[PDB]
Structure 1
Amino acid sequence: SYVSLSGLSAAQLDLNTTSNNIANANTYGFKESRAEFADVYSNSLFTNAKTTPGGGAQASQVAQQFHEGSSI
């Protein structure tokens, strides 16, 4: 269930990032943001690996794409 909760958190973070990008559609000089995620896996000393599933999804960083915007 914690993996599903991590997925929900990642989806909601992406939703919030997209909402911020949409809200700032008219702000002058604003630069959009992109949400990048990463997998989670344990590193125990005695790990079965083949018999151990994943550990969900973890937010890595919110990017700050700096590509040139349009000019008015």
Structure 2
Amino acid sequence: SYVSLSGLSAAQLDLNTTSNNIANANTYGFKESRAEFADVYSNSLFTNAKTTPGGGAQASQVAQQFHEGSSI
């Protein structure tokens, strides 16, 4: 259930990042953000891996995309 719960958290973090960008659609000088995710595959010396599934989805970093915006 933790792998599924990780998927909800990763999807929820992306949803919050999109909402923040939409909320700041009018503020001057704002730079949009991008949420980047990475996998989770930890194993140990006591866990035959060929037959072990991953750990879910982990948030890598929320970017700060700095491309030039339009001018008013």
Normalising by structure 1, report the TM-score: 0.95
Three-state SS of the structure 2 residue aligned to 1:36 is strand
CA distance in structure 2 between the partners assigned to 1:44 and 1:66 by the alignment: 40
Deviation at 1:44, TM superposition (A): 1.1
**Large movers: runs of 4+ above 4 Å:** none
Give the percent of matched residue pairs that are identical in Structure 1 and Structure 2.
Answer: 100
Secondary structure, in 3 states, of the residue corresponding to 1:54? coil
Q: How far does residue 54 in structure 1 lie from its aligned partner after superposition?
A: 0.8
2:6 corresponds to: 6
Gaps of 5+ in 2: none
Scaled by the length of structure 2, what TM-score is found? 0.95
* Cα displacement string for residues 19-62 of structure 1 (whole angstroms, at most 9, x for unaligned residues): 00000000000000000000001131233121100110000000
